[PDB]
Each structure stands twice: as structure tokens, then as C-alpha cells.
Design a protein around this ligand. Structure first.
Ligand SMILES: Cc1ncc(C[n+]2csc(CCOP(=O)(O)OP(=O)(O)O)c2C)c(N)n1
Ligand SMILES: Cc1ncc(C[n+]2csc(CCOP(=O)(O)OP(=O)(O)O)c2C)c(N)n1
Ligand SMILES: [Mg+2]
Lengths: 665, 664
């Protein structure tokens, strides 16, 4: 065809190919197969403004098949987003705006970081949830202030991953009809023909969840794809999967339809044969005709600027009609917590006892009253995790204004949805499960950390104290596994007051996820934690119980439920003439950020007798106790028995702490 | 009423009484599932309570692990080594009846469960092993390996992504000997299933390619028996039998409510329930002799007979195929063939190899010399170098193939590997990029807990991966596994270390081994060349000695950073600093050595210690102490040629030297 549409589509293909050739690295097959569908979505259906890529009401887009990144970068560049030709010529290079997989925060117009398969779809589900929640909270009368779609492109690999199955079940249950996923269905995986590992009916599975499924038989037919997208948008009650049958590496005589086109450059000669197949006559690489830029200018820039202008005008009128509502929305879009929200938070008195899951619950209910942007839930453990907002309604297909989310037994989808909710903007979000099952959502926590998303995890039942449910349900290594990960704050509060401070720090976060590690069992309120708690916990470690002498005989370090044990041990040590300091370390990461002077004041370099106590793996503790110190931890799995019995047998008693401290002196 | 109904109500009352006594546990599912489970156990399953490890028994996985009293009741009543006193010690310290089923702890328990989703996926792995072994060993009418794999699961299992992955895989492989009974009761832990779950499970399973059979009344054992018969008759598709039950059936006030899921019924409710069953036994934990006799006839005698017939056939088979039979006997016992290691490669000085490639060379050497080897990759065979080039693919058309194509299903691969190892007869491995070890982490955890000697081939271990960028570059993955109890983590420094590491992985009997391997070529190290197996077996060793008996500094490194450390040693010597270099391929193996050995490697008198590893610094202070330092990476990576990232992140001789001098 000689149409401008076909030329634009082939420009996307050749730009992707040429950038991959020049990098000598990347994935050309999918941009070649998927260019027509993506072009159709991008220029004929999506509402977006290249000049304002963070427009709050733009249609969102997730490239779940992140390896196809050049498809996205081509579209951004061609459309007038701030991705330049020189940027494309630096694909996969040090410090470029065009990294091998899409990275939120590094490239204008990229809505989510993808690459790990499956998560893109689950993240988009979260964005769609956020859109409906915000629309229900803020829209009034004729002011459809929040009103947009959520689009994704995925491939076969995405649909094999369990996290996409979870997310797709959840999305159908919530009737998220503004979620539309285009599935690049090309019968090919990295290792070879898809039929060597996969033969299910994706269409029937999705209908079984409750999705609308539309098939496009010829992926090069943009009229068919446009009809499908129009059909998807007219269905209001079901999320839609459009299965678009394409040829991977379309155009390549020798690589099309083969896994060879998936994951490395076509090569010099194959590239020429491919351009020949496209009737692409340009002799120079990275060629774009001005009329292609003009095509995108009319269909994307002009349309998106008009849409944004009309939205801005409406927002002005909305703000006149509903000043307080509009003001709350502006604050939420900007991630601002209401002045004084924290004055609402609880305080635990001396001589009181409370599990930190319960103080966490009390805090969640205090936040729900004072922070209108709060939105979250649990993976089918609301009662156990204590995450429920008792004065709020449930988020359901029938009431999107409800704040309580029922994720079901879907930890990984929850973790990814939370990222989508945070990416959308407007909401402060959290999700709960047992700490032991944090492992189920680990890859999504890793994406939150990389994307710098201030989500909050409520991880309860943090130790062998869990008791009867046994070793499959008792965390051991989970703390270390999170503490080692870049850009994740891990806070394990020692009592009710430390937990209030920990939640405060989680809610105030702007650039990193925060994992709150909480007990099933009641903890006593600590005298040393009671005053100035927020400032103490903010330091990460502090002296919870001072020694009598300026220079201690020994320093006891402990976290969470072990701080009370360490304090009891300090008392018993003092009877025997050993003068111990006790340090509560609710957060190693926050402590490490403190000044050398502060750290020296808590852990003086002159005191080398140091004993750490924590019901979790010993891994990582020698950073603080050193070669001459010691650690009472747990480096085996747990047991099935009443929790107090296990704790006793595993050595978490005053008598045992005292003995081990003396052996070390 | 019938002896069947009596036996069933006995299962129900024993479960309730044991949970009452423990004041802990989940009674609802035992109550609802007792009839279906009784039917399976006594009418279809072939098993010998007297010999619970019989190699050709039908395997059983209670995927809904919280219903554990259901299993303990059946085991006890059937004559397995689970006593009445054991039942009376449900959930107590040291008992044989822990809150969730624990393989290796309790006679007759085939798999540890509790983490939802994984039971089903583990069962898929057991089914794969059964067909692979059948294809390899059966000849003519000697069906030596010929049994079923059954599981019971609930709604929670079927919401988890891992069960979805595993079911897609099981249908693709046409595992018709896998039969899953789905206790479908409309309730999850937090209340009505319809608060979070409304999909058609039956239609989803049909879409995968499973046979699906509905039983409308979970109390109708004749209908349940018909469904299982129909399941067994269908040889090409795995079967899901959706059994519609009432959770906590029999309880006037808790039946059909989440209230019966996870707490004891309570004293008063237990009476009302027992009244509902027309159960008139005045004493707790009561079993009529006629119930024991029912199980003796339908389970013990049947299973004894089946095992004896199997023994007879095995003997006859061995006369016709002595080599095969000897091989099977050794494999069932986890024995590796005498001299199998003579076959392994050796890397000469002056040669270069990526450790993924040396791993692939070893994989192909093992395939030749160890007949029990069986494994694959999660759609990364080409990149992980896991493929056995002289072997066929494991498919629906040829179960004898050794190369498994797991597809993009890391978690199900991990759980399937556990099932393969549980079955017995096979040494198994699975590969993916190390960065995606995170996707199968909960299955690694169950391998460690169950003590299964599976092997993970984790390639592309660091920022050296390069252009694919930070989502594909491991940072914290080493620490995250090193911290886990009972997991061996080995990061070989060159081709020879990798050969030794594979040998240690294959020889394992009681813990999983993670092999951490490079995309990029590494040089062969002089100090690793001789006695490599014994050196790597120690976990850490001096790869390049200092000149003096007491070094000025110790450089510690692992994997790809050992060559850098040796280079740095050379540079330091020129400036009058005498360094010792220690290669630490495995922290866990070093930790297991004597204090005497450790002192020989990291003498306490040398406190100037500097560790180098392209990963998180977390954990290194165990070795470098408060006075030492570490050059690691505590941020995410970047998209660029791998050598550029390595330079920018400070992994150069010049920077190592600079920093070492700084702490002197
Ligand atoms: C969780 C995860 N596992 C494995 C991979 C490696 N990987 C990237 S693409 C792919 C298979 C190709 O998927 P598909 O989208 O079907 O390929 P296409 O036809 O789109 O090129 C694999 C195994 C990954 N990126 N993420
Ligand atoms: C991975 C994981 N997440 C969460 C849990 C906690 N949990 C156990 S059962 C359950 C609800 C599942 O209900 P189902 O298995 O259908 O119970 P039934 O009605 O069969 O008793 C939850 C959230 C778990 N065991 N594993
Ligand atoms: Mg594909």
C-alpha cells in the first residue's frame, strides 16, 4: 500500500530495526509484527498529549512485552514526545533515554517499567482500578474529571506467567471495562515454536474469567484492529483482550515467523532484504519522511492538545462548582498529605500490651479518617492482617468508591496492582499478607523499588511466634531478603508506639516502597520508645535503654519483638555487674543513612562487645556486631507448636541471652 | 447406616476432636471433603500403609494443606504409622502431626504443603516424573512404573498464579494420570468467595485442555466414584473433578461460612455437629473396630496385594532386562554410577569460558554418564545453556525425552522440580536468568524445607548482562538465597570451579543447590586448576597466596570477581602491599568447615580484609568485619554494554587498589 498509514507503520519498523542494528543488541521481531496494531491504537484511539506526558487524565499505556521497547520509543519519537532521534541512536547505551527495556522516570511518556514478563498486565490492572476509584470519588454532575482508558500490549510470554492470570481474574471480577489489552499473538517464544510449551486456548481462558475477547485474524489489517478497539471501548462491563494474529519479524524473508527474529539484530544483509520487502527505498539509516511526522502531528499532537485544553477548561469550571473537592483532588494529584493529618494518630501508654498488627490496624483506621487519598487491602487475609478500614466500604464492581480492596489469594497480582495504583497518581496505597508470603510478590516489590514507588506493605505474622501453622508459615530469611534489596525501607517496630512512627514514615515516603514487619503476638509498651518516638524511629536505630556508665560493657542490639527481651536481659546482666546498653534498630536502611557522628553515638567504635538478638536469619548482622560480637538468630526453619514453646526452644529467653553474652565477654 | 458413612463420619469426628484438643486448626474442609477423600483413598488409590515409600504407589498431595487433619485421619485409620496418640498431639511440639503436612516428618505424607497453589504444581511435577520414568523403563508388558497422581485442592489454590502455570503445562504435556479433586465450597478465609473470585474455573480448565467433571453433591460417594472412574478412563487429559461441598458440613451454625475454615468449632458446636452426624460415641477420639476393619480390607489388604504382584513382576522384568533393572534400582536409591565423574571437562590454563558455557558442557557430560538426569529451562534454554544436545524433548508424543520445555513459567518450574525430586528416580535441574529466581522463590523455600537435592541453573548473574538493563541485572539475589536456611549457593570463579560446583550439586542428597553463572567469558585461574573439587568443596580457599606467611591484606571475591582480585593482588605487590586472595564460591559450604580450616583461610590476626563482588554488600561483614571493607553494588544496574557498567560501578583494578590502600 502507498497510504500514509502504511508508510508510518513501516517507518516504525525500520526505525526499530536500524536502532537495534546500531546498538547491536535488542529485539526486532515484535516491533516488526506489532507495528500496525500499535500504530492504530496510538493514532486512532488513545487520548494523549506528547507535550504533556504527565497529563493526569491521559489514557495510560503499558508495554507489558518490554523487550519490544523500540516499538514504544519509535512511537514516542514520531509522535513528538521528548525522545529525540539522537536518543534512538543511543538505544541501549550508557545513560541514554532509551534503555533496553522501558523505564518509568527515565523516558518521557513511559508510564511503567516493564521487562519482567506478566507484570505489565498486572500493573495495568492496578492503574485501571485507580482510575475507577478516583472517578467514583471525584466526578460530579457533568464533570467527568477522571475519565480515561488503560491500554497494554502483551505477548505470549506475558500470558504464560501466573501473575497475569491472577490479575486477569481480578480485573474481570471488578468489571474493569476501561482496561483493553492488545495481545501480539505470533506463535513464537524465545526458544522456538510456541507449540513446544504452550497449547491452551487463551481466548477461552479469558472468556472464562469474564473478559470480552476479540480476535483480529490479520495483524497487518489496521481497519480490523480499529474495529476491534472500537468494539472494546463500547463494552463497559468487561475488560477486553484483543488477540491480534501477527507474524513475528514480519518482512524478513529469512527470519519472519521464527524465534531467530525475537532477540538479536536482523543483521546487515537481512536488514536490506527486509527493507526491500517493505518497498522501503531510503538508502540512509534512521530515515523518516516529513510527511510521517506530519501524520503523527495531526493524529496525536493536535488531538491530544485539544483534548487537554478541553479538560483544563472543564477542571476550571469544576473547581468553581466544587472548590473543596477540587482542592482535595489537586492536593492528591500532587501527593500532598493534609496539614495536621498526623495529629490523629494513636499513642500507647506504659503498662499496655498490643500486637503490632493491631497497632497497625488502629493506625490504618486513623489514616483512613484523616488522609482522603488512602486506598488498599489484603490478599484474602484482611481479618488476620488487620488491614481493614472499618468505616469505609468495599471496592467492588458495584461501588468503585469503596476504599477496601479484596485482592483474593493473589499476592503477586496485588503487589503489581499496587505499583499501577501508585503510578496512576492521586492515591496512597498499601497491601497486606503474611510476611512469609512476601516471597510470592517479590518481583513486584523489586519493580516498586526500581520505579521508586512509595507503596506500603503490611506484612504480619513476622516470626516463629506464629506457632501452630508451622515452618511453611514462619518467616526466617524474609527480613534479610528485603534488607539486601536496593531502595526498599524495612521497618520492624518494637511496640505500639514504634509502629505508629513506622506507619508515619511509610505514608510520608515519596521515592521508595516501605515494608512494615508486624507481630501476631502482643508486645509490651517500651519506656525507652515512648517519648519522641517518631524522631527515634526515623534515625533507624537509637538507644532504647542506656547503660549506666558512659562506656557500656556490652551493647545489645535488637529489633521488633526482641527489643523487650533485650531490655529484660540488660536488667539481668546488671545484677551480675555487666553494664549493657540496649539499641532498638527498627530500620537498618534508615540507620545507614544517618551521619557518622550519629552512628558513633549509638554504636561507639570503642565498644566491640556487641550482641544482636532477632528471630530471623543471622545474615547481615555482622555489619553491626563485627568479628568480636555475636548474634542470637535462627538459621533453620521453624516448627509446629504453640509459639511460646518454639521461642523457648530456639533460645529466645532471658537466661539464654545472658549466657551467650557472658561467653562472649 | 452403611459402613462407608460410618467411616466417613469417623474421619469427621476425629478431625474435629483433634482440632478441639489442640485448640488450633481448620475443621471446615475435613468436614466437607471427608466423603470425596474417603472414596478416593479406599476405592481408587493403590497404596500400602505398611510400605509408604513403595516406588509404584499412587501419589497423593493435599494441596489445601490446612485440611491436614483430613489426611492424618485417613493415614491413622488406614494403618499407616500415625497413631491415636499422634492425633492427640496435633500441632504440638515434636509431634508427627504438624499443622500443615510435612514430607519426611510423617509416614505416608508425599509432599509438604501449606503455601497455596504449590501443591497442585508439585503434583504436576510428580506426574511428569512418573511418565518420564515409565517411558524410560517399561518394556513390553512390564509396566514397572505405572501409577496415578492425585491431589485435593480448594479455591485458594486455584486463585494462585502458580497453579495456573502448572495446569497450562500439565495440559500441554497431556498428563492424563494427574487427577485433582477440587473441594468447591464457595468460601475463602475472609468470607464469601464472591468478594474476590467469580471466574468459571471449569471453563478455564477446559480452555487449558483438562477434562472437567462436576460432582453436584459432595456427600454422594457413588457420584464421586463415577467421576474418578471416568477420570482414569481418559488417558490424554489431566482431570479436574469439581466437587460441590458444604464447608463445615454438619455444623448447624458454622457450615457454609468462613467461620468454619480456620478455628476449632468449639465445645458446644462440636456437640451439635456430632448430633447432626447421628454420632453417639460418648468418648472423644472414638473409632469402632468395624471402621478399622473397613480400611484394613479396602486399603491395607488391597495395597499389600498390589505391592506383592508388583514385586513379582519386577523380578521377572529383571531377568529380561538386568541392566535396566539394575539402573532403576540405583536411581530409586539416588545412587550415581561408579566413575560418572571421569567424564567431566577440564579447562586448561590460557583458556576462556563463560560459566554458563562450562555449565552447558558439564550438563552434556552428565547426560552421557548419569542416566537419571532430567531437566530444562523456563523458555531460556538457548541463553541458559541448559539443553542436552544429544537427547530428545520431553513431550506428549515422547515421554522418554529428557529436555523439558517449561515455557515462561518460572514458579511452576520450581514447584514441578520439587515434585520430580519427591517422586524419586531422577536427578533434576531447571534454568532461568538469576534475576528471575525471584519468581520461583517460594518453591526454592519448599525445596529447602523438604530437603530436596534439586539444582537451579541461574545464568546472567550480574550487571555484566549489560544492555537488557536493571530489570535484568541481579543485585540482591545472592544475599536473598544465602540467607535462606538449607540452600547451597555456589558462584564458580571459572570453568573448573563450575565443574566442581556441578559435581557438588549433583551429589547433593538433602538440600537444593543454586548455581550462579556468568553470561560473559572468564579466564581460567591458575589457583583453581589443581584439586578444584576439594577446594570448591571447602566453600572458600586461598586461590592466590600472599608472599609472606602473614599477609598485609586479604582480598575475598567470588565468581567473576576472583580474576579481578588476582589482578589487584599483582598490582598491590608492585606498590609493596602483600595480599592474599581467597575465592569463596560458597559461603554456606565454608561456614560448615572446622574452625581450624576457616582460620587457615581467614586468619584472625589479619583484620585488613576487602571483599569484592558484583552484588549487594549485605552479608559480607561476616568476613570483612568492622575494620574491613567491601566493594559491592547497593543500587540497581543500568542499560549499557556490560563492560561499561562494570567500569562505571568501580569494578576495575585501579579502583580496587585505590580502595584497598585507603583502608590500610
Ligand atoms: C519473568 C520473565 N521470565 C523470562 C523472561 C525472558 N523472556 C523475555 S521475552 C521471552 C519469550 C518471548 O515472549 P513473547 O512475548 O511471546 O516473544 P515475542 O514473540 O513477543 O518476541 C522470555 C522467556 C522475562 N523477560 N521475564
Ligand atoms: C500463598 C498463600 N497465601 C495465603 C495463605 C493463607 N490462606 C490459607 S487458606 C486461604 C483461603 C483459601 O481458602 P480455601 O483453600 O478454598 O479453604 P477451604 O474452603 O478449602 O477450607 C488463605 C488466604 C496461604 N496458605 N498461602
Ligand atoms: Mg510470541
Amino acid at each position: 500500500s502507498h497510504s500514509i498509514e502504511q508508510l508510518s507503520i513501516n517507518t516504525i519498523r525500520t526505525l526499530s530495526i536500524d536502532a537495534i542494528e546500531k546498538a547491536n543488541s535488542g529485539h526486532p521481531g515484535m516491533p516488526m509484527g506489532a507495528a500496525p496494531m500499535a500504530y492504530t491504537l496510538w493514532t486512532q484511539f488513545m487520548k494523549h498529549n506528547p507535550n504533556n506526558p504527565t497529563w493526569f487524565n491521559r489514557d495510560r499505556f503499558v508495554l507489558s512485552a518490554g523487550h519490544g521497547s523500540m516499538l514504544l520509543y519509535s512511537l514516542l519519537h514520531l509522535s513528538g514526545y521528548d525522545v529525540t532521534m539522537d536518543d534512538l541512536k543511543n538505544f541501549r547505551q550508557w545513560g541514554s533515554k532509551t534503555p533496553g527495556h522501558p523505564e518509568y522516570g527515565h523516558t518521557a511518556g513511559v508510564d511503567a517499567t516493564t521487562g519482567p514478563l506478566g507484570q505489565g498486565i498486572a500493573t495495568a490492572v492496578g492503574m485501571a482500578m485507580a482510575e475507577r476509584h478516583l472517578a467514583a470519588k471525584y466526578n460530579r454532575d457533568a464533570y467527568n474529571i477522571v475519565d480515561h482508558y488503560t491500554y497494554a500490549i502483551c505477548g505470549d510470554g506475558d500470558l504464560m506467567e501466573g501473575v497475569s492470570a491472577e490479575a486477569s481474574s481480578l480485573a474481570a471480577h471488578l468489571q474493569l471495562g476501561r482496561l483493553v489489552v492488545l495481545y501480539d499473538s505470533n506463535d513464537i517464544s524465545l526458544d522456538g515454536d510456541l507449540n513446544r510449551s504452550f497449547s491452551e486456548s487463551v481466548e477461552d481462558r479469558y472468556k472464562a474469567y469474564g473478559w470480552q475477547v476479540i480476535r483480529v485474524e490479520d495483524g497487518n489489517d489496521i481497519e480490523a484492529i480499529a474495529k476491534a478497539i472500537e468494539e472494546a471501548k463500547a463494552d463497559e462491563k468487561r475488560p477486553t483482550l484483543i488477540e491480534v494474529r501477527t507474524t513475528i519479524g514480519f518482512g524478513s524473508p529469512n527470519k519472519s515467523g521464527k524465534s531467530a527474529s525475537h532477540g538479536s539484530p536482523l543483521g546487515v544483509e537481512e536488514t536490506k532484504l527486509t527493507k526491500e520487502a517493505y518497498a522501503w527505498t531510503a538508502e540512509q539509516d534512521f530515515h523518516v519522511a516529513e510527511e510521517v511526522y506530519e501524520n503523527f502531528r495531526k493524529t496525536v499532537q493536535d488531538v491530544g492538545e485539544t483534548a487537554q485544553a478541553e479538560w483544563n477548561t472543564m477542571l476550571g469550571e469544576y473547581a468553581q462548582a466544587y472548590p473543596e473537592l477540587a482542592n482535595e483532588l489537586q492536593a492528591a494529584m500532587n501527593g500532598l498529605l493534609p496539614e495536621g493529618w498526623e495529629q490523629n494518630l494513636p499513642t500507647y501508654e506504659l503498662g499496655s500490651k498490643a500486637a503490632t498488627r493491631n497497632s497497625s490496624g488502629a493506625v490504618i483506621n486513623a489514616i483512613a479518617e484523616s488522609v482522603p487519598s488512602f486506598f488498599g487491602g489484603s490478599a484474602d487475609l484482611a481479618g488476620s492482617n488487620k488491614t481493614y478500614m472499618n468505616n469505609e466500604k468495599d471496592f467492588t464492581r458495584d461501588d468503585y468508591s469503596g476504599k477496601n480492596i479484596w485482592y483474593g489469594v493473589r499476592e503477586f497480582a496485588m503487589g503489581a496492582a499496587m505499583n499501577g495504583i501508585a503510578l496512576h497518581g492521586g492515591l496512597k496505597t498499601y497491601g497486606g499478607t503474611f510476611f512469609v508470603f512476601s516471597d510470592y510478590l517479590r518481583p513486584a516489590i523489586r519493580l516498586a523499588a526500581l520505579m521508586q514507588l512509595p507503596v506500603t506493605y503490611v506484612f504480619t505474622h513476622d516470626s516463629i511466634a506464629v506457632g501452630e501453622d508451622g515452618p511453611t508459615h514462619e518467616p526466617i530469611e524474609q527480613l534479610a531478603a528485603l534488607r539486601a534489596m536496593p531502595n526498599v525501607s524495612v521497618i520492624r517496630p518494637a511496640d505500639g508506639n514504634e509502629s505508629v512512627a513506622a506507619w508515619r514514615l511509610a505514608l510520608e515516603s515519596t521515592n521508595k516502597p516501605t515494608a512494615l514487619v508486624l507481630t501476631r503476638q502482643d508486645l509490651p509498651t517500651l519506656e525507652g520508645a515512648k517519648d519522641d518516638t517518631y524522631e527515634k524511629v526515623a534515625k533507624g536505630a537509637y538507644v532504647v535503654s542506656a547503660s549506666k556508665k558512659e562506656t557500656a560493657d556490652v551493647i545489645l542490639l535488637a529489633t521488633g519483638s526482641e527489643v523487650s527481651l533485650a531490655v529484660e536481659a540488660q536488667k539481668a546482666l546488671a545484677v551480675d555487674g555487666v553494664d549493657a546498653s540496649v539499641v532498638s534498630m527498627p530500620s537498618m536502611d534508615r540507620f545507614e543513612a544517618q551521619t557518622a557522628e550519629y552512628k558513633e553515638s549509638v554504636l561507639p567504635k570503642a565498644v566491640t562487645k556487641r550482641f544482636a538478638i532477632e528471630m530471623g536469619a543471622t545474615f547481615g548482622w555482622h555489619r553491626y556486631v563485627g568479628l568480636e560480637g555475636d548474634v542470637l538468630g535462627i538459621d533453620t526453619f521453624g516448627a509446629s507448636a504453640p509459639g511460646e514453646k518454639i521461642m523457648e526452644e530456639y533460645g529466645f529467653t532471658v537466661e539464654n541471652v545472658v549466657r551467650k553474652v557472658k561467653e562472649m565477654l
